[PDB]
Amino acid sequence: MELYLDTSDVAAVKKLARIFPLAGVTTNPSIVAAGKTPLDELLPALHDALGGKGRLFAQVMATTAEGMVEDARKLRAIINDLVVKVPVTVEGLAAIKMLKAEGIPTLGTAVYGAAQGMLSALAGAEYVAPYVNRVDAQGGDGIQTVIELQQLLTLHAPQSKVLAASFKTPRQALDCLLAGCESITLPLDVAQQFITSPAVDAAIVKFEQDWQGAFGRTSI
Amino acid sequence: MELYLDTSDVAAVKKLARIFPLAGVTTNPSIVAAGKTPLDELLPALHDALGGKGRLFAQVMATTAEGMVEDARKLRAIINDLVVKVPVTVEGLAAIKMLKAEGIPTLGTAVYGAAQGMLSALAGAEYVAPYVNRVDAQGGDGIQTVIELQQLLTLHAPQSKVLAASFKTPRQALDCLLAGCESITLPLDVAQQFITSPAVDAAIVKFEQDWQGAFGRTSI
Amino acid sequence: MELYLDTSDVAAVKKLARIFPLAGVTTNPSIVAAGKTPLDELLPALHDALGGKGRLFAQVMATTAEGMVEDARKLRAIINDLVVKVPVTVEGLAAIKMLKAEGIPTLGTAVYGAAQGMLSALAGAEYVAPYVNRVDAQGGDGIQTVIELQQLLTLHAPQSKVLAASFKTPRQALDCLLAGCESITLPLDVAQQFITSPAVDAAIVKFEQDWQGAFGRTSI
Amino acid sequence: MELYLDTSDVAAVKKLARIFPLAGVTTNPSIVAAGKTPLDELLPALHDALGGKGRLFAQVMATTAEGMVEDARKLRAIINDLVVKVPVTVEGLAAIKMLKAEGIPTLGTAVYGAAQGMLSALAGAEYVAPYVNRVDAQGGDGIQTVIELQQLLTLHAPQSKVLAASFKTPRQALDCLLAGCESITLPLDVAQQFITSPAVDAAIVKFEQDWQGAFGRTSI
Amino acid sequence: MELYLDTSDVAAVKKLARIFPLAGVTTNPSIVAAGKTPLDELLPALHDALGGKGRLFAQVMATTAEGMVEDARKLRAIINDLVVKVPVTVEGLAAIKMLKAEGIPTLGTAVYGAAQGMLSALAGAEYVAPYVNRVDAQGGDGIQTVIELQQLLTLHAPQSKVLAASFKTPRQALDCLLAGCESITLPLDVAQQFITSPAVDAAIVKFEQDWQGAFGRTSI
Amino acid sequence: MELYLDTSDVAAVKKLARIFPLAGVTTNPSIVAAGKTPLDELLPALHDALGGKGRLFAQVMATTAEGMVEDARKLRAIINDLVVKVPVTVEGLAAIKMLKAEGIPTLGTAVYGAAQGMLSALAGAEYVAPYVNRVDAQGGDGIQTVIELQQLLTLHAPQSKVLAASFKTPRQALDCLLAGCESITLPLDVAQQFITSPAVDAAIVKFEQDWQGAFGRTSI
Amino acid sequence: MELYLDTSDVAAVKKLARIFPLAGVTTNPSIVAAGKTPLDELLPALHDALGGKGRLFAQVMATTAEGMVEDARKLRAIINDLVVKVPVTVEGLAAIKMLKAEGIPTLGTAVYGAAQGMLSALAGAEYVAPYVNRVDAQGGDGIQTVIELQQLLTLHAPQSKVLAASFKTPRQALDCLLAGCESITLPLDVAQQFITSPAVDAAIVKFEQDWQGAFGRTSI
Amino acid sequence: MELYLDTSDVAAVKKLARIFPLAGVTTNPSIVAAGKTPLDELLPALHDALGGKGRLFAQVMATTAEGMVEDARKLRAIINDLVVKVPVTVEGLAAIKMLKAEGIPTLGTAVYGAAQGMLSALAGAEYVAPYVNRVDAQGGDGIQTVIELQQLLTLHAPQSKVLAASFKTPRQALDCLLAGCESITLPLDVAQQFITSPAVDAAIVKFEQDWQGAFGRTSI
Ligand SMILES: *C(CO)[C@@H](O)[C@H](O)[C@H](O)COP(=O)(O)O
Ligand SMILES: *[C@H](CO)[C@@H](O)[C@H](O)[C@H](O)COP(=O)(O)O
Ligand SMILES: *[C@H](CO)[C@@H](O)[C@H](O)[C@H](O)COP(=O)(O)O
Ligand SMILES: *[C@H](CO)[C@@H](O)[C@H](O)[C@H](O)COP(=O)(O)O
Numbered sequence A, B, C, D, E, F, G, H: 001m002e003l004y005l006d007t008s009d010v011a012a013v014k015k016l017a018r019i020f021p022l023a024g025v026t027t028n029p030s031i032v033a034a035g036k037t038p039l040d041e042l043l044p045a046l047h048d049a050l051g052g053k054g055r056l057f058a059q060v061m062a063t064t065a066e067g068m069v070e071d072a073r074k075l076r077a078i079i080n081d082l083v084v085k086v087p088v089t090v091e092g093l094a095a096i097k098m099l100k101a102e103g104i105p106t107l108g109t110a111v112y113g114a115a116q117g118m119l120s121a122l123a124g125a126e127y128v129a130p131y132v133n134r135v136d137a138q139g140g141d142g143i144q145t146v147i148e149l150q151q152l153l154t155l156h157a158p159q160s161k162v163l164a165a166s167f168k169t170p171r172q173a174l175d176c177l178l179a180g181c182e183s184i185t186l187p188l189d190v191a192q193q194f195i196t197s198p199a200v201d202a203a204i205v206k207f208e209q210d211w212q213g214a215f216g217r218t219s220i
């Protein structure tokens, strides 16, 4: 499993990096914009927040294959262990092929369908990122798309991983993990919901009370 | 996975070959007819359009086993990396056996049933091409035929591949890929539908607007 | 896969042997009786019709184990490499054990149930032949029996094969192949229905018509 | 349930009318041809064989809608309780509509697909006859076609009945009956196999022996 | 639900009649033979053992339809309201038709298949008795037959009931009841296993012990 | 739905009767024993605790059918709205029939099997009480037994209800309710677990904090 | 597969050893009692009946772990290839552990639940014997218990085998074999029903008649 | 399989260690409190009760990661084969990563959801303990949680084991074992229910009675 946070919130990353076993951090253009910090400042700050390690993802902005290759090189120049996100379009697939030839690692992003995702893998992408919640929000079935995508990679491109993205609820992320995604990126709210529980907190309170009853303290 | 285009449109192949990871091109007599170019010109033109690589498929026209072997030899003489398509009939099965003994690679084509398809594999065909849409169009279940065929090859002839063909909609090609077909050939219209999406385009537009909003430009 | 014809029609075998990839021919007492030719004549003629190769099956007629062993020797003297069909009865099971010790290969035949079939394989039979249509015809479920038998051999006697037999329709044979039977014997009528199709013929006519339209012939 | 025999064998109908609860007899062009007896002789002979009752079916031979209507009138003039079989083609559908307007009851025949069958019912046919075995024989799934057809009539045309036809084994006819077909026509061989069983015969012998053992006779 | 015992043991019937809510008793020729008492004695004695009420079943012995009708009259003269069991054979089906016309109620017995059973109901039988254990014992699936039979009666002859018969274990009878059989006949051994349980007995002992503990008795 | 408490704890019944919509209280000999109060005092005390309404259940102790009828009469004399529990044994079934004829309402209790339970319904019991946890505890499947019992009553005795009993965990009682049990009796501990939740409590606390944050008070 | 007979009938073992491929014979206290022959006479007689080979099983009678160990030693002293059956109780489990330490092979018997059976395997038993029919008879589901037990051994104790026992019908034993039990012990009646069939016998008669029809004799 | 008891009852562990094949004992704060013995005395006492062997589990009480690590060291110092239980909270996850870095083996406890459980395994926990009954008791689906957790570990952290805990009924524990949990801890009541059975006790009595009948003693 590779566990990523999906954020441009450097302070949150520093805090959460000591809690979760993080592989690194993913960004997209909206997440970067939200943080109002440019990439050449953000990506080193994220690297530092992870404890000077981890893999980062950032997305090209150009709309031609040739421009996307240029963007990929610019992103790779910012920080070492960076994977370039390329939208799986006509021009994006062309760029993924060129980047495969050059040996720049890619992720095929903005995947709304299983076959589209598979094509990105076949073209050389190491990761494929379905937009689970976006498919859900637009009247589709995000989890079914992920099940189909994972099946396609397992059958037809086993070198590539699904990096499941776009979540509003833990249930979606859990469902992607159950479908066998080998990587995932969580927004901060969903990541924290996984490990915060009234039931768990209540169990701990009850243990403390029982221990106190017997021993007149709540510590070992 | 072997991804093929099902076409005689040389210019379109040249265009799409930089976008898709193509294994090559399949033809049939109707496809060749539509292009109005004899195989002895078409096949080298396709080879060039692919970037001087890839595997081509072309179909025999004779109605006897002996005549089909003669066709096969003529086809193999046009170009090196060529697989001969043989309709899976009485005479076609007989020809497939002869071509096995001769060492000419074959695809069993015009497959409308799973047992018919399996028989061509057992006779020596490296590929078996079910006509998915044709089964669908004539009141059958194309995908179920593909599932059954794939199961028969997996169980009984695992060195042979399904090369799924005959598509009107991406969903048909997806369902074939999900059934485990190790090769597929797409018409141009379906191929392009896989990689053109209003939802993906809208995602990209929204990324651009968010980026512009924060950084006052549309670029990295 | 081992594909057999279920016939005493020598000329039919010679004809079909150049079409199908045959493993050989099975006979039973009714099939032999229908052809009016005794075994010491038929079996050599079948061997010849196959091109001087392949595996033949013939059935004992005696009703005691000792009698069946004597029959097996007589059959093996006619065809040295022939597999002896023994009905899976009380005496038939005893004969199978005796033939295993003697090193004469057997098939357990007239199997109407899975457990009966498995018992013949445990006793030493290399093949087990359920009578699929006869189970169907008598108000059972022949395919369900085959599924159960195959599961028993897979679990409990994996060295033995199901040789599915007794067919009125291609669908029954197909379902047996889907159930994982590693061998099958087809009557002539079913075998030919597999490779005869109005849909396939119409596909070929359309191809010829399209080709002639463009090029004024149907020749490569 | 309406149980038919599918035959032109007048003597056999008379024999079986005593045994089965027959609704009548179906014919088609091939069945009529086999029996050697023209319809104007055959249809009265079948009526008498049934005990001067029951419903008969006979098929038009013309290839235009107008010609089929003329055939329909001729058939109805032969025999009172007669339903006209019309092949479900372009011209057949047109004829079914016309015959509906004229108040001549029809059956939509030569149905190889569910949608085709449903169309005949929507056009006015009181019965729809899938050719179960012919779908099975040509590498389809006849029973699946019947399940789909029945589902379509139940949902969309509940005044119309499936009259399941074309059988090589009792299992097919059973499966049709389980699918909910409210009418069926059996060939003589399949019909008789339903009611002839080694297991049944053996039970009755055992009853007779036990009864004799106790009471010294095999009678009440 | 109609619950029957399958027995010629008069004293057992008298005993069990105060335990079970019995609808009556079934017999067959072997069951009658086992008790060594002729019908003209047994059947009145059974009627008496039930408290002078309930429905009795007895089977014809003749092998022609006319003979079976004569037997039916003889049986009905012994018990005026008795249901006549007729084996579902060729002649048995003819007899059922004749008995329907004559207004003598019938059960179609020795049913080893669903279609055979349905045919007896269509011919006029008010009950159909599949031999569940005999189907099981001979390498079939007795419960599957019952499920199929019940489905056929529900779909095609809802006025007739399955009277499930032939049991070695309570589980078989339970499965028949779960399948929706509206009547059943139990051998004495199975019937008593239903209402005899080590677990139930232990529950009662515990209750008695707990009660005595608190109140020094086991009395209300 | 009829919701019962399974208890002799009068004070607890009084407490819970203002919280739950109770149909009444069930007892058994162990439950009565635990409370150390004879039925002639307990049953009127429960009636008062319920608010002077509801249906009570109490169990016979005798081991003969005659003795069980005597117990039943004694119980019915203690209080009006009372259903007599009878263990479903040989003598218990006999008693259930007698009590039907007398017009005393019964529940068939100590049910460890579906057929046993159905028999008590057929004999006249208005309720049938499977011991769910006891079946679970002794290596069976309590919920499956309840599903089967409910199916038997629905099919064969639809005027009788399942009264599900014997619970260690809410999940068991839920699964019984989901299987369609029209009545249930809960021990105090399970009853209360249904309506006590750390998650619900935390929701309420968070609502209070949000409300306070906005309005500077904790009240409407 | 290991096939056992479950019997103390020495003559029957000798008769059937010729027919079945027997691994040996199982006994229990009741089977031994029925046969009238003490173990020190019985076990050698069974060994001889098997042809001086095979594996025998016999059950301890003591109620303490220490006593069961003493019984185990006594049984092993009788006969070389002997596996000691220990009931899976509190004291039985303790004995299985001790016997494991001592290197005496055991079978955990009187298993009525999957978890109980798994515990015996974990404690050292090489075989676990569920009482299939006894679970069926007492209102459980014996086959479901076997499926669960087998699942537990496959997952958690794969060196241990299910030895399925206690059968009233062939269907139960078939279902156990389909569930994946690697050993089974059959009573004589069930064993013989597997290999005696009206349908099989009828097929052989038909073969004989056809053969006679063609060749004027019923012999090879 | 690793089988644990979930207890601080030293005498009970002594008694049951000779019965069950125990891998050791689990404790939690409430279980420790119930026994009123501090861990520095309890853990040696359990070690001895097991026979001077086995693996013990004990839980940290601190609420900060750094505090939990200090607890972990204290616990490890008490006894060698000691796995530290850490609640899977924000601070608990942090502590699990630190304890991984130090090489102190951990179990993630207080798991009420699958994703929470998986995160503890990714963080370095060798075991993950879902609180099955607590999920059941609070209106969730404990077994489904276990199924999902097991799936997540099999897919994503296969070096980690499920240690299923928190049980009120044998059925819960069985279902966890069927789900593939490689370790389990049972409370005393559930553990003993597995090997207490009225049906088993009755089988043994009948054996004893049969033996006595034949041989005039109840000894071997
Ligand atoms: C530790 C996990 O291995 C165990 O002691 C568990 O915490 C208990 O099994 C929890 O059960 P309850 O919460 O029902 O006491
Ligand atoms: C990169 C993919 O690996 C990630 O940052 C994802 O693109 C985002 O999570 C996508 O989220 P939305 O589609 O909801 O903006
Ligand atoms: C060869 C098979 O690999 C292809 O050219 C196929 O024949 C076509 O896909 C068939 O299309 P139609 O049968 O619909 O013309
Ligand atoms: C031998 C089995 O391998 C074959 O010849 C079979 O016996 C026959 O196919 C049996 O089927 P039919 O009895 O329907 O001919």
Ligand SMILES: *[C@H](CO)[C@@H](O)[C@H](O)[C@H](O)COP(=O)(O)O
Pocket (backbone or CB within 6 Å): D006, D026, D027, D028, D030, D031, D057, D085, D109, D110, D129, D130, D131, D133, D134, D163, D165, D166, D167, D185
């Ligand atoms: C009328 C109902 O369609 C019948 O006579 C049927 O047409 C025949 O059963 C058709 O037989 P085939 O489809 O096997 O030729």
Ligand SMILES: *[C@H](CO)[C@@H](O)[C@H](O)[C@H](O)COP(=O)(O)O
Pocket (backbone or CB within 6 Å): E006, E026, E027, E028, E031, E057, E085, E107, E109, E110, E129, E131, E133, E134, E163, E165, E166, E167, E185
């Ligand atoms: C009549 C059917 O209602 C019954 O007496 C049945 O014929 C018997 O139960 C048949 O079963 P067996 O042949 O196993 O006794």
Ligand SMILES: *[C@H](CO)[C@@H](O)[C@H](O)[C@H](O)COP(=O)(O)O
Pocket (backbone or CB within 6 Å): F006, F026, F027, F028, F030, F031, F057, F085, F107, F109, F110, F129, F131, F133, F134, F163, F164, F165, F166, F167, F185
């Ligand atoms: C009567 C049934 O409605 C109740 O009192 C039940 O007998 C109890 O629920 C049974 O509990 P146990 O059998 O577990 O003591």
Ligand SMILES: *[C@H](CO)[C@@H](O)[C@H](O)[C@H](O)COP(=O)(O)O
Pocket (backbone or CB within 6 Å): G006, G026, G027, G028, G030, G031, G057, G085, G109, G110, G129, G130, G131, G133, G134, G163, G165, G166, G167, G185
């Ligand atoms: C040993 C394996 O357990 C065998 O002898 C079996 O115990 C018997 O099959 C048990 O028979 P019942 O369970 O029907 O008494």
